[PDB]
Design an enzyme around this catalytic site. Structure first.
Site, PDB file in Angstrom:
ATOM      1  N   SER A 139      63.109  61.876  35.684  1.00 51.53           N
ATOM      2  CA  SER A 139      63.324  63.310  35.533  1.00 51.53           C
ATOM      3  C   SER A 139      62.759  64.079  36.718  1.00 51.53           C
ATOM      4  O   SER A 139      63.311  65.107  37.124  1.00 51.53           O
ATOM      5  CB  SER A 139      62.701  63.798  34.225  1.00 51.53           C
ATOM      6  OG  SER A 139      61.340  63.427  34.133  1.00 51.53           O
ATOM      7  N   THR A 191      59.755  60.852  33.741  1.00 52.07           N
ATOM      8  CA  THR A 191      59.247  59.804  34.668  1.00 52.07           C
ATOM      9  C   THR A 191      59.497  60.208  36.112  1.00 52.07           C
ATOM     10  O   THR A 191      60.481  60.871  36.413  1.00 52.07           O
ATOM     11  CB  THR A 191      59.916  58.442  34.401  1.00 52.07           C
ATOM     12  OG1 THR A 191      59.642  58.024  33.060  1.00 52.07           O
ATOM     13  CG2 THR A 191      59.403  57.390  35.361  1.00 52.07           C
ATOM     14  N   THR A 192      58.586  59.823  37.000  1.00 52.02           N
ATOM     15  CA  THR A 192      58.759  59.988  38.434  1.00 52.02           C
ATOM     16  C   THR A 192      58.404  58.675  39.112  1.00 52.02           C
ATOM     17  O   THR A 192      57.267  58.209  39.009  1.00 52.02           O
ATOM     18  CB  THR A 192      57.878  61.112  38.984  1.00 52.02           C
ATOM     19  OG1 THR A 192      58.079  62.298  38.212  1.00 52.02           O
ATOM     20  CG2 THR A 192      58.233  61.406  40.427  1.00 52.02           C
TER      21      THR A 192
END
Lengths: 223, 228, 171, 203, 232, 236, 244, 203, 197
Positions: free
Chosen positions: D112, D1-2
């Site tokens: 991440s 995920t960002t």
């Protein structure tokens, strides 16, 4: 206003508490007195066997009852519980004053909360501790008074008046349990309107004396 | 909710009165179906009739419950009955019998006549339907006291006495109604003794239909021309 | 749970306590010949050496529970006077090694006592009849006498319910 | 995920990628990771809305972002997130560490891809960003996470909350990873599958 | 009549009658007073001798709470003990949660909330005692007086009981004419003796200078000086 | 028994709530609150009948929070109960929602408690009328008043007590002829004291009044010395 | 013990007393149209200095449902708080959508009925007119009584002037009413009921009508609707009175 | 891994105005195959639910959702729709989140009012995964993911949708040790549902 | 207690139930609108009959059944008739906001035993054993008939004799209970044959 323990009367009285105090006047007389060294309980049992009016709480303390005996059993068992707890947590003989205050605080609860009734029994507690001999008078209202001598139950006013007149004498009886017991048996006599070896009951505790109860032949020499 | 000196329970009797003031309900079971009926009471102009709920409520695909008395209490009973009907399936994978649901509702009503701090339900109920994998109709009554009974035809609510007298001398035990048409005819006739009808027919295989206003209209026309 | 302004809260069982044992007796008073006479348990055992002659069932259950609990806890027979407190008009009778044979009726010990509607006359008859030298035979026969106007506790037998026809014939 | 949040001169903007992964497998290629707490409070991560709405109705006041932060952190402490929004007291940008600790920021990143996005934020963030500059910056940070992190991919979701006006949610703001057309059509002729039984179901 | 048989009921006048009957119960109690001096407080109470058989100095009436609060009350003495027991629990809990001893105004509020709570529900009875209490804390000497209603205020001097009016007549003169702790003890003895018009005078006091802020009873020579001043 | 517990009478009235209203006047002190341009002032009569009382303690104005103050009409025991509960609620709100409770939110919460007492038969209503004043962070100066029935509403200016109608009449006349336009809280305090004097027709000393002022980020009560300055400024 | 009990006649006494409390209440009314529902009420005041804008007698329960009352205001306030609470926890958190008007009305009736059968609690002294929209039933208007009984209405009035208001609505109400005509009729019926001053500050109206996406507070989610409930402002009411 | 004890796979696909949902029929105790009749697809009206994972949890959730949808239909007097049912499933899984059910559900159906296809899945995070193309679940999720991602094309006709989904299921099941022993495919239309049993490897 | 006496009145209005125990079996008989269309097994060996409020009988019967099964679950041995009677009596005692307006006849056999048992319980919670008993409306008359037609020294010897005595006493449904969990309700035609004879 007298239907329950919670209602104040317009004059500010708690009628149920006064009725509980009147319950004691139905009980037979018991007398208590002490010198500095010894404290004595003298009780008129009533019959059938004569119900025992004295109760032993410890080697160092005991009590007698006037009025409703089941309430006496409850209060005395609570007193044992407190003394045992004190010896359990501190190895400390619970002081007579503190035991009296515990009874005071326990009984007052029933005079304020709904659903219960005041204890209809008045108790005389005698004990010996580091402060000497003690005598306490307990009442259904919760009031506790430390006294030189007293009498509770039916027609106890005569014994109380005799004790008032004799106070100058029996306070001086140090180290003479027999004379104290004689004064006590004489005091209880004025409340009669008699004493037999089985009717009468006597208890004593003091400096050397652990709390003991005389019934039967034991009380014969004092009548 | 305590016994009278003569042994009756005051609140239960007053709840029975509350039921007696409630609107009518009637049910007749024939050979193949149970028919439930009620007068609409749609005399008010501004009532939203198209969304107004019917007196008859489904508890499960095979059981319906009618009532007379306090509507608010009836809804509590209906929701409890629905929850129990589903819970029975969830526990044992079979639908409730009409006897079981009737007993549950009667027990709920009874419990409020004995438990302290609550008042009885002012509702009597007619429970009709068919048992699982069965074809014989069942019709039952419950009332606030908590007792229940089976019936071939029954009416509850206001004017129940009159239309029950009518039913007693029109329903024949030896030759009960043989078809849906005769059941609906008898139900409409019984309700017309009290002076617009809603009729619900429950049939085996979970077939429950509310008869359309035109259909009751035709039944009423036939009955009226018979009256002449 | 209230006091009066004067300060007070708002069959026939006959027992005789002798030094050879206590005797209890009761009028069964069945309502009809249909009632199972065996099922009239109006004298019951509380412990091996304690019994009573009469809410009754619940109290008796709690008394039995207390007695058995005391026996389990102390490996000793509960003193009758202690039981009266730790625990219908009652006659509680039992034996112990502290005071021996006892009978109780707030509980007061009695040499002999009668309860029920006949109590008011049975008390006078007891006062006139009871004496210390009664042997268990005379105690039984005097129980029967005052009934006319069974069970026992002994150190050898403990509590037991009676034989009875014979003691009636001997009256 | 960002996930990134970027506070700018008149509001705050949060953005996210739209890839959900079951280990190494992409379960959802278009997951929406920006969640409303209220109309102008949004959150993203790597009950609170209903309670916020109920309290807004009770108090008859616009929700505070601090209220959502407080409730959410207390909920997590009882049993990462970025919560950003505008309320009568201005625009806010908070992060919650799911063990209970929270902090304020002018630009944040989570997931991440947090490091790859934070590199862009550190390189390009400045005081007094305009709305367009902030949207461009948040989009660039998300794209850096997308290209450089295996757990981030697909598209960019952006939510822009400016103080004077309503929040604008830009679902799939950028779609840089659209799939090419397959070389062949794999349509089977009808009758390819062998069937045992055919039945009509009474739904 | 009709609205006074239960504790939670308002009468049409808005007055709660059970609390007023509790006040009547207070009025029957023996006179007790409190006096605030420039650095402490003094407590005194009239102890009536019911009989010659009471041991003459061991039926203590003034109660200490923690170490810096003293309490004296008139009315149903057992209710006063109950209230003081609750006060001791509150002070101990405060000292447990916070190592500082409970401030006097905080203690007064705790007791007032407890007493007022007994005027809410019908299942409980109001306290039949008005309690003079006070002490010395980080911000000086404080003197308070509860009422069965739960009401309380700070006082320069307080009196309650059967002789409360006569005692107040002298407290007013004290405040008008002044009062250090030494003189406060003697004046308390004088007020008790004047209001009494057998009994045992019990006195107590807590002053920052003369007791280092701890509550102590008056005994021996000081007690006898107070008594002879009162007789004088 | 409809007059002894909170249940409907045949008229639909709740006589116990109405009797709780009567209790609010039994302290016989009047109070009024006015809103300035940017601050709120509360004035209350500090009637002290006994010379032995410490006047510092006689007070019906409570500091509920840094921003909210509350003045109570009714018995002091119930007033202190209400003040303690309001303080607890304001702290719990600041804890749960992360910012100071607004004045109107506190008024609503207190009125909901009051309504609960009016619904549950076990609990009697408190005989207190609560008036909350603050300068809200959003709405500015605010006055909200709660009553034993559970009803509350915001006010431009309000008075409470036995002579409530007279003070309200004076305020109504002024508001017709004219919030209170002043530049500093001292002037609006002087205005409030002036209208209290005029409506009650009774001069006040520094001992007769208790005054609470709500300003941005602080509600505070004036000491007798400050009220002395205000009375002097009125005398001028 | 139960405070609401059956009388010998079978009636529940406390319910009758609560209905009397309602009949003493201020008049409020609702009118159902082909394309909306209007619910209105007039606002008496405790004092001319009271800020009547702080109290709203018409409240939003869900963005598509709104309620007005007649009777005791605090009871309505707590009952609305409970209604919102249950509409969110017991329906929306489970199904992801706000309850339809029928089910929310059933749940409010459930709350009111419990007070009628639980011990130690009196009935709610309010009757509610609950107007709402849902996709399957359309616009609907329900009246809920202190006993928990509820019925749907085309138009209705509750409170002090309910009899005259209903007699007027029976004449005025008809099918093919547009929501603007329903508002006009509501304002006329409310004017004929109010004896005091009649203006946008003494009157409170709300409508269930078209979705208002501008009030949604955000943009970009095409499938979100926006509230259908909308309180008419003081100026919006005044402009309509100026065309009455 | 509790989900891997019994195996099995479910796949749902969207066609042109129609939906397909398919599952394998094997129930096993790990290596041992027990039953070839354990259908993992249930319907609650016009909405279908495929549940993979621990078989006891599959049965428990089938019973629970039958209960809940029966009550919903009684109270609402309307059948539950695929979207409302997806929300109901999501909330029901959450109510047991601590001590969860070891299941992966797949909702498939056609919304009766709009009449357009709907399929949704639920991941380990509990996030609803509503997909326009296809949802896969079970042990062969990887095999299914690749197979569906290659075979699927938009707007399949029902007869082509059947072939595509059946081939996807058959070829993924062939490569999964714990899946097989037959397959069933439902083709869900506005008006009817056709249930078909597929011939496949019985090893 | 007043409530218990009013519960007794409710019992005495209820339809009468009767039971007679012979040498080998216990027989329970019971007195059962135009449009309308008693003995409950507690366990395979015990049956319970009641008179009074039918609604409260369901509560008692359910509790008795639950206890009869819980006894087997906790102790292998099925309940004895004595034990079940005692339990039912205690349940009735505890409820005395209102008592159960029901008196119960409890009949059956003890596990692996052959002495028939018949017991009675009343709303106060008192219970007793009987050779024959009736409860409910006009129970006094039929009990008086039983007292003279039932013989203590020579009770009924066969199922036919017990059923005959029960039917005569009632003058209808009849339940016969026999050892080894043998409980049967007589057919309508059998009862008709008994009645005519």
């Amino acid at each position: 206003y007298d239907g329950d323990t919670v209602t104040f009367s317009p004059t500010g009285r708690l009628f149920q508490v006064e009725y509980a105090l009147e319950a004691i006047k139905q009980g037979s007389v018991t007398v208590g007195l002490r010198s500095n060294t010894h404290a004595v309980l003298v009780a008129l049992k009533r019959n059938s066997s004569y119900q025992k009016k004295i109760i032993k709480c410890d080697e160092h303390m005991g009590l007698s009852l006037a009025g409703l005996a089941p309430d006496a059993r409850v209060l005395s068992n609570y007193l044992r519980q407190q003394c045992n707890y004190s010896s359990l947590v501190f190895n400390r003989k619970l002081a007579v004053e503190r035991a009296g205050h515990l009874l005071c605080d326990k009984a007052q609860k029933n005079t304020q909360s709904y659903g219960g009734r005041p204890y209809g029994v008045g108790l005389l507690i005698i004990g010996y501790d580091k402060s000497g001999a003690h005598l306490l008078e307990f009442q259904p209202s919760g009031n506790v008074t430390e006294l030189y001598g007293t009498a509770i139950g039916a027609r106890s006013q005569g014994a109380k008046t005799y004790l008032e007149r004799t106070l100058d004498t029996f306070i001086k009886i140090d180290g003479n349990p027999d004379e104290l017991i004689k004064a006590g048996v004489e005091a209880i006599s004025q409340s009669l309107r008699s004493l037999t070896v089985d009717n009468l009951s006597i208890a004593i505790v003091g400096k050397d004396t652990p709390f003991t109860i005389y019934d039967g032949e034991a009380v014969a020499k004092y009548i | 909710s305590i016994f009278s000196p003569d042994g009756h329970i005051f609140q239960v009797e007053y709840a029975l009165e509350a039921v007696k003031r409630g609107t009518c309900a009637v049910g007749v079971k024939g050979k193949n179906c149970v028919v439930l009926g009620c007068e609409r009471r749609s005399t008010l102009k501004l009532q939203d009739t198209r969304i107004t709920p019917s007196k008859v409520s489904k508890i499960d695909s095979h059981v319906v419950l009618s009532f007379s008395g306090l509507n608010a209490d009836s809804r509590i009973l209906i929701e409890k009955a629905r929850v129990e009907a589903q819970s029975h399936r969830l526990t044992l994978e079979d639908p409730v019998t009409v006897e079981y649901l009737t007993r549950y509702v009667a027990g709920v009503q009874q419990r409020y006549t004995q438990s302290g701090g609550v008042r009885p339900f002012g509702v009597s109920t007619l429970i009709a339907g068919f048992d699982p994998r069965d074809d014989e109709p069942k019709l039952y009554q419950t009332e606030p006291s908590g007792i229940y009974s089976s019936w071939s035809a029954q009416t509850i609510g206001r004017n129940s006495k009159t239309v029950r007298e009518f039913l007693e001398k029109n329903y024949d035990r030896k030759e009960p109604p043989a078809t849906v048409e005769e059941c609906v005819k008898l139900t409409v006739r019984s309700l017309l003794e009290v002076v617009n009808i809603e009729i619900t027919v429950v049939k085996p295989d979970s077939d429950i239909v509310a008869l359309s206003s035109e259909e009751i209209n035709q039944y009423v026309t036939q009955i009226e021309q018979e009256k002449q | 749970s209230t006091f009066s302004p004067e300060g007070r809260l708002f069959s026939t069982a006959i027992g005789i306590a002798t030094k050879e044992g206590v005797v209890l007796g009761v009028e069964k008073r069945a309502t009809s010949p249909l009632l199972e006479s065996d099922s009239i348990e109006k004298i019951v055992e509380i412990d091996r050496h304690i019994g009573c002659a009469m809410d009754a069932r619940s109290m008796i259950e709690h008394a039995r529970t207390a007695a058995v609990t005391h026996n389990l806890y102390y490996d000793e027979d509960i003193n009758v006077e202690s039981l009266t407190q730790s625990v219908v008009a009652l006659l509680i009778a039992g034996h112990d090694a502290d005071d021996g044979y006892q009978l109780f009726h707030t509980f007061y010990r009695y040499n002999a006592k009668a309860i029920g509607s006949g109590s008011e006359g049975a008390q006078a008859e007891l006062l006139n009849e009871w004496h210390s030298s009664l042997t268990l035979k005379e105690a039984e026969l005097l129980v029967l006498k005052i009934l006319k106007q069974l069970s026992c506790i002994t150190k050898q037998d403990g509590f037991k319910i009676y034989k009875t026809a014979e003691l009636i014939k001997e009256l | 995920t960002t996930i990134v949040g970027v506070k700018f001169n008149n509001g705050v903007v949060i953005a996210a990628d739209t890839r959900s992964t079951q280990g190494p497998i992409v379960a959802d290629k278009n997951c929406a990771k920006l969640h409303r707490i209220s109309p102008k409070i949004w959150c993203a991560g790597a009950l609170i809305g209903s309670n916020i709405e109920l309290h807004s109705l009770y108090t008859s006041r616009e929700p505070r972002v601090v209220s959502a932060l407080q409730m959410l952190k207390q909920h997590l402490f009882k049993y990462y997130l970025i919560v950003a929004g505008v309320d009568p007291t201005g625009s806010h940008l908070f992060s919650i560490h799911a063990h209970g600790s929270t902090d304020v920021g002018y630009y944040l990143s989570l997931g991440s891809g947090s490091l790859a996005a934070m590199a862009v934020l550190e390189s390009h963030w400045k005081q007094d960003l305009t709305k367009e500059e902030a949207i461009k910056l948040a989009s660039d940070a998300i794209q850096a996470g997308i290209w450089n992190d295996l757990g981030s991919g697909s598209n960019v979701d952006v939510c822009v909350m400016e103080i004077g006006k309503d929040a604008e949610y830009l679902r799939n703001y950028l779609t840089p990873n659209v799939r090419e057309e397959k070389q062949k059509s794999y349509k089977f002729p009808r009758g390819t599958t062998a069937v045992l039984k055919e039945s009509i179901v009474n739904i | 009549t009709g609205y006074d048989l239960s504790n939670s009921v308002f009468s049409p006048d808005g007055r709660n009658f059970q609390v007023e009957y509790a006040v009547k119960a207070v009025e029957n109690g023996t006179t007790s007073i409190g006096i605030k001096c420039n650095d402490g407080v003094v407590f005194a109470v009239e102890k009536l001798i019911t009989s010659k058989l009471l041991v003459p100095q061991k039926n203590v009436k003034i109660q200490v709470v923690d170490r810096h609060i003293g309490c004296v009350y008139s009315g149903l003495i057992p209710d006063g003990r109950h209230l003081v027991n609750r006060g001791r629990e509150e002070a101990a809990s405060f000292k447990k949660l916070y190592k500082t001893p409970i401030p006097i105004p905080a203690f007064a509020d705790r007791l007032g909330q407890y007493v007022q709570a007994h005027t809410l529900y019908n299942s409980v009875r109001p306290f039949g005692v008005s309690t003079i209490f006070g002490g010395v804390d980080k911000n000086g000497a404080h003197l308070y007086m509860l009422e069965p209603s739960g009401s309380y205020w700070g006082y320069k001097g307080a009196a309650t009981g059967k002789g409360r009016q006569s005692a107040k007549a002298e407290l007013e003169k004290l405040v008008d004419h002044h009062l250090s702790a030494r003189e406060a003890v003697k004046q308390a003895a004088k007020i008790i003796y004047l209001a009494h018009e057998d009994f045992e005078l019990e006195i107590s006091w807590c002053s920052l200078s003369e007791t280092n802020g701890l509550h102590k009873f008056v005994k021996g020579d000081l007690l006898q000086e107070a008594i002879d001043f009162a007789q004088k | 028994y409809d007059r002894h517990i909170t249940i409907f009478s045949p008229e639909g009235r709740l006589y116990q709530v109405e009797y709780a209203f009567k209790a609010t006047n039994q302290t016989n002190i009047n109070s009024l609150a006015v809103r300035g341009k940017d601050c709120t002032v509360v004035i209350s009569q500090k009637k002290v009948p006994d010379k032995l009382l410490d006047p510092t303690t006689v007070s019906y104005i409570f500091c509920i929070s840094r921003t909210i103050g509350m003045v109570v009409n009714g018995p002091i025991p119930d007033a202190r109960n209400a003040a303690l509960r309001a303080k607890a609620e304001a702290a719990e709100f600041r804890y749960k929602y992360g910012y100071d409770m607004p004045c109107d939110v506190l008024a609503k919460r207190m009125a909901n408690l009051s309504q609960i007492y009016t619904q549950r038969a076990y609990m009697r209503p408190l005989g207190v009328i609560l008036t909350f004043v603050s300068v809200d962070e959003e709405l500015g100066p605010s006055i909200y008043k709660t009553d034993p029935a559970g009803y509350y509403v915001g006010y431009k200016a309000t008075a409470t007590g036995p002579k409530q109608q007279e003070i309200t009449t004076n305020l109504e006349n002024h508001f017709k002829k004219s919030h209170i336009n002043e530049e500093s809280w001292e002037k609006v305090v002087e205005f409030a004291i002036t209208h209290m004097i005029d409506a009650l027709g009774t001069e006040f000393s520094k001992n007769d009044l208790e005054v609470g002022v709500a300003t941005k980020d602080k509600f505070f009560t004036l000491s007798a010395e400050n009220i002395e300055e205000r009375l002097v400024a009125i005398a001028e | 013990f139960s405070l609401t009990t059956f009388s010998p006649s079978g009636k529940l006494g406390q319910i009758d007393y609560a209905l009397t409390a309602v009949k003493q209440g201020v008049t409020s009314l609702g009118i159902k149209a082909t394309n909306g529902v209007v619910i209105a009420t007039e606002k008496k005041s405790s004092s001319p200095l009271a800020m009547s804008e702080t109290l709203s007698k018409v409240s939003l329960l869900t963005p598509d449902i709104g309620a007005v009352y007649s009777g005791m205001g605090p009871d309505y306030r707590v009952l609305v708080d409970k209604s919102r609470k249950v509409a969110h926890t017991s329906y929306k958190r489970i199904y992801g959508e706000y309850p339809p008007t029928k089910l929310l009305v059933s749940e409010v009736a459930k709350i009111m009925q419990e007070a009628t059968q639980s011990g130690g609690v009196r009935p709610f002294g309010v009757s509610l007119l609950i107007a709402g929209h849902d996709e399957f039933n359309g616009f609907s208007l329900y009246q809920v009584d202190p006993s928990g009984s509820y019925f749907p209405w085309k138009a209705t009035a509750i409170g002090k002037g309910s009899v005259a208001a209903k007699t007027f609505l029976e004449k005025r109400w008809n099918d093919e009413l547009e929501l603007e005509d329903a508002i006009h009729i509501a304002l006329l019926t409310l004017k004929e009921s109010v004896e005091g001053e009649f203006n946008g500050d003494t009157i409170e109206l709300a409508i269930i009508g078209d979705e208002n996406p501008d009030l949604l507070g955000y943009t970009g989610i095409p499938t979100d609707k926006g509230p259908r409930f909308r309180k008419l402002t003081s100026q919006e009411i005044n402009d309509r009175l100026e065309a009455l | 891994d509790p989900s891997s004890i019994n195996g099995g796979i479910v796949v749902a696909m969207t066609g042109k105005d129609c939906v397909a949902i398919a599952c394998d029929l094997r129930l096993g105790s790990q290596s041992l195959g027990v039953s070839n009749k354990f259908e993992k697809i249930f319907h609650y009206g016009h909405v279908f639910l495929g549940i993979t994972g621990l078989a006891t949890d599959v049965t428990t959730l089938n019973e629970m959702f039958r209960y809940k949808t029966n009550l919903y239909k009684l109270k609402e007097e309307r059948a539950i729709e695929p979207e409302t049912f997806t929300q109901l499933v999501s909330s029901s899984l959450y109510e047991r989140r601590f001590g969860p059910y070891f299941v992966g559900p797949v909702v498939a159906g056609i919304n009766s009012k709009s009449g357009k296809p709907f399929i949704a899945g639920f991941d380990l995070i509990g996030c609803i995964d509503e997909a326009k193309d296809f949802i896969v679940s079970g042990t062969a999720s990887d095999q299914l993911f690749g197979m569906c991602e290659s075979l699927y094309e938009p707007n399949l006709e029902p007869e082509d949708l059947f072939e595509t989904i059946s081939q996807a299921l058959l070829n993924a099941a062939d490569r999964d040790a714990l899946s097989g022993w037959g397959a069933v495919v439902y083709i869900i239309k506005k008006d009817e549902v056709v249930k078909r049993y597929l011939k496949m490897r019985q090893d």
